[PDB]
Amino acid sequence: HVETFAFQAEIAQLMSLIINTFYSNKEIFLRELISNSSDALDKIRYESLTDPSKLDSGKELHINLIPNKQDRTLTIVDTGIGMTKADLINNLGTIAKSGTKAFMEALQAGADISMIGQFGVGFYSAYLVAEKVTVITKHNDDEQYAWESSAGGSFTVRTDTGEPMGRGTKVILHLKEDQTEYLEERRIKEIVKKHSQFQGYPITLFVE
Amino acid sequence: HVETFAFQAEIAQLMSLIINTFYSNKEIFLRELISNSSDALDKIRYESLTDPSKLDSGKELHINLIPNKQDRTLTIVDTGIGMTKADLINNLGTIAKSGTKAFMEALQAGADISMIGQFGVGFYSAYLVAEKVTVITKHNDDEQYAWESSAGGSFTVRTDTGEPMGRGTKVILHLKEDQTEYLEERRIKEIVKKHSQFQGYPITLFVE
Ligand SMILES: CCn1cnc2c(N)ncnc21
Ligand SMILES: CCn1cnc2c(N)ncnc21
């Protein structure tokens, strides 16, 4: 079945600022989520150094970028450590609150939105370009789940019925109608080469 | 007793470049290590969300900066997750190698040293200002250890005899003789306010 939850009020308010506030360097959402995938991979790798059996769910450590003009979605796939039910419901929220509140301070007090990842809340930069975000995720210790929000204050969590992925995370961006440039091959290569490309696992772009 | 180990050749070569290569924005070492402390704290906090008993070794989550003109040392203390014997010997090394090799690519191919933390190897920026670095560390699952290097290719690891700290990490910088400006109160406040001060735990400076 499906459970509906409210965002914490500060995450709710950050999400409203991102959605509305007119801002035209929206391409940063992609380095932020590639960066989140990098971290996830570092974590399952690190864990696998004292327990090779954590990799039983997959040896491959990579990030895939999969545009789809027909569904109008850009998907970021990584084979990182994934996320548990408590992560999606309570735990990531709690860790996010301070980063959030602080970021909202830096926003109304000078600084620009490109600095979201410096406060550990880059994930929400998805809402620059996406109307709905769907996250399919699987951690060694837990079931596969789907998390979904279109913002406006709430989110859903159901255990995921569909195709098993073994371990990792798949962020599905349902792109706003004026944001389709991010489904184009060379738009994508340009950003990926531009920003993120220090770290550090293979980033493969799937051509349609 | 004391065990002596060789650095991996790429860490050895990064450490030589940092030590020698004349470079005059050396104040970045401090945001890099404050940033490492921030991460450590995020990790023990995150872990404590599904197991409050991880905090049995200390509820306080903070970073202390302790200059000492007499011993000529600047110490960074955090009550983060700390580091185990395998972390100091094998595990952090392994995770560092790619970041390292890549950073050395960016160094001889344009980019400047301020970008060390972007490759997850900021810790080594200590050697801009320190001749010897001593690290006292304690993880819930392991004994207290001391790690020490003056570079030139090797490092030591002994189980730490002295004053128990409960949990966390204490980075002791034995400052080079021309680097004593980093023992001054307002030098320290200036850098700490300048760079790092988005995230996100209390940073307390101890006055002598
Ligand atoms: C910070 C939480 N978080 C955000 N993105 C991810 C991810 N792709 N994999 C695992 N955890 C994540
Ligand atoms: C990346 C490894 N690492 C570097 N610094 C620390 C630290 N203070 N506490 C825990 N781990 C650390």
Side-chain angles (χ1 to χ4, degrees):
Chain A
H1 77 317
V2 192
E3 293 175 311
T4 308
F5 302 89
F7 276 112
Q8 315 237 220
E10 325 89 22
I11 320 298
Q13 69 184 79
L14 181 65
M15 293 176 79
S16 255
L17 216 71
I18 282 151
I19 273 141
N20 315 321
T21 306
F22 176 96
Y23 175 82
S24 295
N25 189 218
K26 299 184 193 259
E27 85 202 60
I28 52 88
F29 84 89
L30 186 66
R31 68 132 203 257
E32 281 333 311
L33 306 166
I34 280 175
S35 181
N36 277 2
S37 291
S38 180
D39 290 350
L41 291 150
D42 283 347
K43 169 71 150 310
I44 188 61
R45 194 167 57 192
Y46 167 86
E47 283 191 3
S48 81
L49 293 201
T50 60
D51 187 348
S53 88
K54 276 169 192 277
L55 283 190
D56 285 350
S57 31
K59 287 275 188 288
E60 298 193 299
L61 299 169
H62 60 244
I63 306 166
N64 297 148
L65 310 172
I66 303 144
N68 188 322
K69 287 187 207 226
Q70 222 172 351
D71 305 324
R72 199 210 295 162
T73 66
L74 179 68
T75 280
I76 298 56
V77 190
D78 71 65
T79 40
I81 212 194
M83 275 167 308
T84 63
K85 208 197 178 195
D87 286 331
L88 305 173
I89 294 167
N90 312 274
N91 297 339
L92 300 179
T94 305
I95 306 278
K97 281 190 294 140
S98 354
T100 301
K101 288 181 95 282
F103 188 51
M104 302 215 65
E105 278 166 11
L107 282 192
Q108 109 93 226
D112 106 292
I113 284 153
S114 49
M115 258 155 43
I116 197 174
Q118 262 121 52
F119 294 74
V121 296
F123 165 74
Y124 299 101
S125 58
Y127 295 87
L128 292 167
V129 303
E131 87 207 351
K132 190 166 67 162
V133 187
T134 306
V135 181
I136 315 303
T137 188
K138 175 68 180 64
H139 195 277
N140 288 335
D141 301 332
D142 213 341
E143 295 323 282
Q144 194 161 294
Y145 292 97
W147 176 104
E148 188 170 68
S149 190
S150 340
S154 77
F155 68 88
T156 68
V157 173
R158 51 175 199 86
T159 102
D160 181 55
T161 62
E163 205 79 60
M165 50 189 282
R167 191 203 61 250
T169 296
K170 204 161 148 96
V171 179
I172 316 183
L173 315 148
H174 303 274
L175 293 191
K176 285 153 147 167
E177 157 176 38
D178 51 314
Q179 295 306 138
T180 51
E181 65 191 274
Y182 302 109
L183 306 160
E184 291 156 12
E185 221 178 322
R186 91 244 78 102
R187 191 50 173 114
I188 295 164
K189 295 209 198 103
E190 167 206 41
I191 305 171
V192 157
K193 170 200 171 205
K194 200 183 194 203
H195 325 260
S196 287
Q197 76 144 133
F198 23 73
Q199 328 215 32
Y201 299 88
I203 298 152
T204 300
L205 172 62
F206 285 31
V207 287
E208 300 194 84
Chain B
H1 77 317
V2 192
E3 293 175 311
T4 308
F5 302 89
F7 276 112
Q8 315 237 220
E10 325 89 22
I11 320 298
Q13 69 184 79
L14 181 65
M15 293 176 79
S16 255
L17 216 71
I18 282 151
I19 273 141
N20 315 321
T21 306
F22 176 96
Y23 175 82
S24 295
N25 189 218
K26 299 184 193 259
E27 85 202 60
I28 52 88
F29 84 89
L30 186 66
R31 68 132 203 257
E32 281 333 311
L33 306 166
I34 280 175
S35 181
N36 277 2
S37 291
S38 180
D39 290 350
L41 291 150
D42 283 347
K43 169 71 150 310
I44 188 61
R45 194 167 57 192
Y46 167 86
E47 283 191 3
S48 81
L49 293 201
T50 60
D51 187 348
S53 88
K54 276 169 192 277
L55 283 190
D56 285 350
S57 31
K59 287 275 188 288
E60 298 193 299
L61 300 169
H62 60 244
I63 306 166
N64 297 148
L65 310 172
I66 303 144
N68 188 322
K69 287 187 207 226
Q70 222 172 351
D71 305 324
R72 199 210 295 162
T73 66
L74 179 68
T75 280
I76 298 56
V77 190
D78 71 65
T79 40
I81 212 194
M83 275 167 308
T84 63
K85 208 197 178 195
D87 286 331
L88 305 173
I89 294 167
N90 312 274
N91 297 339
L92 300 179
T94 305
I95 306 278
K97 281 190 294 140
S98 354
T100 301
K101 288 181 95 282
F103 188 51
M104 302 215 65
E105 278 166 11
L107 282 192
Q108 109 93 226
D112 106 292
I113 284 153
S114 49
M115 258 155 43
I116 197 174
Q118 262 121 52
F119 294 74
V121 296
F123 165 74
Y124 299 101
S125 58
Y127 295 87
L128 292 167
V129 303
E131 87 207 351
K132 190 166 67 162
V133 187
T134 306
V135 181
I136 315 303
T137 188
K138 175 68 180 64
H139 195 277
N140 288 335
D141 301 332
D142 213 341
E143 295 323 282
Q144 194 161 294
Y145 292 97
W147 176 104
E148 188 170 68
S149 190
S150 340
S154 77
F155 68 88
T156 68
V157 173
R158 51 175 199 86
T159 102
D160 181 55
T161 62
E163 205 79 60
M165 50 189 282
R167 191 203 61 250
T169 296
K170 204 161 148 96
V171 179
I172 316 183
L173 315 148
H174 303 274
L175 293 191
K176 285 153 147 167
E177 157 176 38
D178 51 314
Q179 295 306 138
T180 51
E181 65 191 274
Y182 302 109
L183 306 160
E184 291 156 12
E185 221 178 322
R186 91 244 78 102
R187 191 50 173 114
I188 295 164
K189 295 209 198 103
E190 167 206 41
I191 305 171
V192 157
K193 170 200 171 205
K194 200 183 194 203
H195 325 260
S196 287
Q197 76 144 133
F198 23 73
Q199 328 215 32
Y201 299 88
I203 298 152
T204 300
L205 172 62
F206 285 31
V207 287
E208 300 194 84

